[PDB]
Amino acid sequence: PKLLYTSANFLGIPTNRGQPKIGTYQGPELIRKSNFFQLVAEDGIQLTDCGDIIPVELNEAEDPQRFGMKWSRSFSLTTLRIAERVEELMKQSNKSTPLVIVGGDHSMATGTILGHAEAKPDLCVLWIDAHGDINTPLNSASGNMHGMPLSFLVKELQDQIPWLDDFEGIKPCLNASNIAYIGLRDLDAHETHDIRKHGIAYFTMLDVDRMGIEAVIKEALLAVNPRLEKAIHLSFDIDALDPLVAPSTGTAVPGGLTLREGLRICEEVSATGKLSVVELAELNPLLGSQEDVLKTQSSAVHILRACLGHCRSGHLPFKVRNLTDQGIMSRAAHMQ
Amino acid sequence: PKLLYTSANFLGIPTNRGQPKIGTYQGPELIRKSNFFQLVAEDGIQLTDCGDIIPVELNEAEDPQRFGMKWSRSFSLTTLRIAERVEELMKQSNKSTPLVIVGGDHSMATGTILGHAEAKPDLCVLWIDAHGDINTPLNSASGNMHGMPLSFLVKELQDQIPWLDDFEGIKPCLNASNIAYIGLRDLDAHETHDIRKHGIAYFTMLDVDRMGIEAVIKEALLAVNPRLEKAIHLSFDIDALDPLVAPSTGTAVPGGLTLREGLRICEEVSATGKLSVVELAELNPLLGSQEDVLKTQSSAVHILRACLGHCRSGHLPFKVRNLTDQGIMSRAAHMQ
Amino acid sequence: PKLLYTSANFLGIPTNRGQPKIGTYQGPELIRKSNFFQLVAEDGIQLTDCGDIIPVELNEAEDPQRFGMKWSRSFSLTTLRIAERVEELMKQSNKSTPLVIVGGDHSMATGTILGHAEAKPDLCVLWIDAHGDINTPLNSASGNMHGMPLSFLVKELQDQIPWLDDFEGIKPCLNASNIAYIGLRDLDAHETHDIRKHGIAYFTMLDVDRMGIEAVIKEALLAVNPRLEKAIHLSFDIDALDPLVAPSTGTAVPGGLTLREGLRICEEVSATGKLSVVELAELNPLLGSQEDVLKTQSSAVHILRACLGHCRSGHLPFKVRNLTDQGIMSRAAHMQ
Numbered sequence A, B, C: 001p002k003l004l005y006t007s008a009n010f011l012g013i014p015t016n017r018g019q020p021k022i023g024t025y026q027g028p029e030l031i032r033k034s035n036f037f038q039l040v041a042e043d044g045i046q047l048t049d050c051g052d053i054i055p056v057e058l059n060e061a062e063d064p065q066r067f068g069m070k071w072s073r074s075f076s077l078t079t080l081r082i083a084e085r086v087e088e089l090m091k092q093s094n095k096s097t098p099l100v101i102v103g104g105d106h107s108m109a110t111g112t113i114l115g116h117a118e119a120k121p122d123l124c125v126l127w128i129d130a131h132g133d134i135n136t137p138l139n140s141a142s143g144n145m146h147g148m149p150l151s152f153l154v155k156e157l158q159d160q161i162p163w164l165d166d167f168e169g170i171k172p173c174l175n176a177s178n179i180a181y182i183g184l185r186d187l188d189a190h191e192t193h194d195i196r197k198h199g200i201a202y203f204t205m206l207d208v209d210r211m212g213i214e215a216v217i218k219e220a221l222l223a224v225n226p227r228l229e230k231a232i233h234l235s236f237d238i239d240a241l242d243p244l245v246a247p248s249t250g251t252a253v254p255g256g257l258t259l260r261e262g263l264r265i266c267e268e269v270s271a272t273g274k275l276s277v278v279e280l281a282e283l284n285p286l287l288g289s290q291e292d293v294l295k296t297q298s299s300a301v302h303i304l305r306a307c308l309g310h311c312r313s314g315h316l317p318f319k320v321r322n323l324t325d326q327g328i329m330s331r332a333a334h335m336q
């Protein structure tokens, strides 16, 4: 049996200061508690747990609202700490060794992409989400950083980002043409404006309905990675999936991707051989019932396994088993 | 941003005498308690709450069984009261101003369509339901009026409707060729007979499975509104949707439309520019768990928003926001 | 109204020694307690309840592990008892009279197919399951017989089956070319090996996603029954369906068939006119909540009804009802 990726790194980022609901910090543990590692090993992949990044969580006095943003300095400091760690992991592995990141609220993506791009400047981004996460600070109704992580990364948007000194090291490292969305269904008006104005490829649930997920995936890859020349940063918000399948998340929106559609995205991205980083955001084990958490954990594990190359059509055994070798009489042998 | 419909009317009809399970009278309140109105406003639509129609609910002595029908005189009197109110609302608005009606059990449709047709005689009807709701009184196993509302409206069926004096003012205002069903999966044998005999266009879940919802919608519109010349009466039974998505309803049937399929129907109907009335029937907040009710409410709100023109691919802002106008330094400006 | 099958037999097989979770023995009762029989009758089908097969359940001392298998002698003895009963039922009915079997864990299939093939040697098998159920004894991680029932039946696999005297009467009666799988998503590596090596037709959830269920069904029938010449043994594991739709089963796997996809398989198999036996395995009413059991029961009933020829597009009445015959005045007659 052949593998596109024989080894992989696992990294937890328990961000929770990007949105007000406590519990996203438990995301990484939700996956470590699962059978994820075991299942990955059974497919013949060597998965190294690289631990957790410690987010910077300032107190209220140190981090007051600035431009309506909540916890903006905890964000800039966390973003830089994340970027350093991801960069160093990606360069140590510069076949290929994918980095699997479990969050944590989606505000971590500013840091993960920043670091990733430092090691791989020509990357593209596939953003799987019910939301755009591209609100610029003055347009955000909530001030929640998890709704803004792309806005700081996109060059074309920098005239709508307020300057802050502590954000200086957060260099916009993405062109609008390097990003493609899949799964959108709850865009804010100003996000819609920016996405259309700057030509960001986007495939909403309407598109998934009309085109089918197979054509959507194909068109998304065509738009930002036409010849599979670029490393892929796959940023997967669990809330992209339907609430029936991933209820334990802070901003659930009805009419999402089926688990199967989610699997198809990850299977195809994996199969390009260009999956460089996959991050899974917005797991919150403190939301919903016990069964809700189990469903969400289960969905997340299947998604992540798909990213690493798990095939639903089965895998071949590494060693084929033979009855005769154990000194055992078969039915065929007995009849002969 | 442009809108097909800039204003709309909202009307509650808390019918509950069309079926035995208490709670459909709470349907209108379930939607008023939601964020429906707020969400409609945020899309730039002016929605006027026109209140509730008071159904006529006679006592047992005044309204005994007649031809097996339960509460048939409460029905005829309610039907006429509804018809008057809907007619007057539709004529006051004779662009275009859609009427959104929340029930209430589906027996209200005899009245809503009667009134609608008085103002718009050439209308067509799109009936989205797991059921035919076209049982004639002697064929009904239950005697529940919510299973008969179309039978009194269809001209071709009048030789199978028993005459009752109090039904005189309920004039059959529909031809069989003006109706198309989507979502059917639990037809009674005599409904199947009448539907096929009189050539009523129907697309069951089997058809949805084999054709896909996109082709079904297209064929349904082709059958009853080929050139978008006619006003559309969209009669949406919440039980058309799968029980996983709308559990809180009295006659739930497995294997229904996904929410997305339901949204596609409403999105396409809305986009014709001919949506004249949409009614949503059979919400029952007294059925199922608290979470069941929330799921059902949520599904209903998304469906109704789609009918009014909400786009899952986003809307443009009415006023585009500019950093410089507030006297704020952007990152781009700072770097220059 | 015409019927492909006017009569049918119903048989319970409460196997529970094929897997460790208590409750599959309650499967047959779960269906008898439903409205299944009534619904089948209302479609005009004569369904005869033929009772239950009593499985042989030895004690621990009489049935120790052999080749890692758990309860292997209870299995061989049960297999032979089942085979005798099914053979005798199929020969008594040698139009056509389908046998409907409700389990019981899937280990019963070795017996049902053995008996079926005795009466109909040229049969084909459609295996609807999340799992291959084709583990050979030394490759099974669990030793659970419900994961091995096909391995004893497939001729090409007999050099990997250990000989046991009490298994002598279990004659391999299937060629690898007579079997087609639909719904696979959790194959063990050695199953994948055997399936590919011996050319067993298989359509996994990946295939369902990429091809659509319509093409999958067509290709599955083409592979093992190209000209509808052969009797069909439809072996339906309830766990083939998504856990959202059939939670009450022992080895549930996310991302399964929708109920509608399951219905389409059974509808098409039924419509060939070659449905000879359908068995439904792995119902376990002792698993999950009360609502979970109700959902699972409901899904099972709809599936079974589809197998017997129930049409979601409706059925014609046997006697058409006429208003005038009862001495009743119609609205049409009154107006004339």
Ligand SMILES: N=C(NO)NCCC[C@H](N)C(=O)O
Binding pocket: A105, A106, A107, A129, A130, A131, A132, A133, A135, A140, A141, A142, A143, A144, A146, A147, A148, A188, A237, A239, A251, A282
């Ligand atoms: N992490 C996420 N979505 O994927 N947060 C949701 C953001 C929703 C909303 N637009 C906000 O600005 O807060």
Ligand SMILES: N=C(NO)NCCC[C@H](N)C(=O)O
Binding pocket: B105, B106, B107, B129, B130, B131, B132, B133, B135, B140, B141, B142, B143, B144, B146, B147, B148, B188, B237, B239, B251, B282
């Ligand atoms: N409102 C509805 N369906 O949409 N009621 C269901 C009617 C079911 C059944 N045929 C009856 O006559 O009572």
Ligand SMILES: N=C(NO)NCCC[C@H](N)C(=O)O
Binding pocket: C105, C106, C107, C129, C130, C131, C132, C133, C135, C140, C141, C142, C143, C144, C146, C147, C148, C188, C237, C239, C251, C282
């Ligand atoms: N009846 C069933 N599946 O349909 N059992 C599941 C078997 C799973 C696993 N391969 C085992 O050998 O035990």
Ligand SMILES: [Mn+2]
Binding pocket: A129, A130, A131, A237, A239, A240, A251
């Ligand atoms: Mn999101």
Ligand SMILES: [Mn+2]
Binding pocket: A106, A129, A131, A133, A146, A237, A281, A282
């Ligand atoms: Mn997000």
Ligand SMILES: [Mn+2]
Binding pocket: B129, B130, B131, B237, B239, B240, B251
């Ligand atoms: Mn209905």
Ligand SMILES: [Mn+2]
Binding pocket: B106, B129, B131, B133, B146, B237, B281, B282
């Ligand atoms: Mn209805």
Ligand SMILES: [Mn+2]
Binding pocket: C129, C130, C131, C237, C239, C240, C251
């Ligand atoms: Mn199974």
Ligand SMILES: [Mn+2]
Binding pocket: C106, C129, C131, C133, C146, C237, C281, C282
């Ligand atoms: Mn099975």
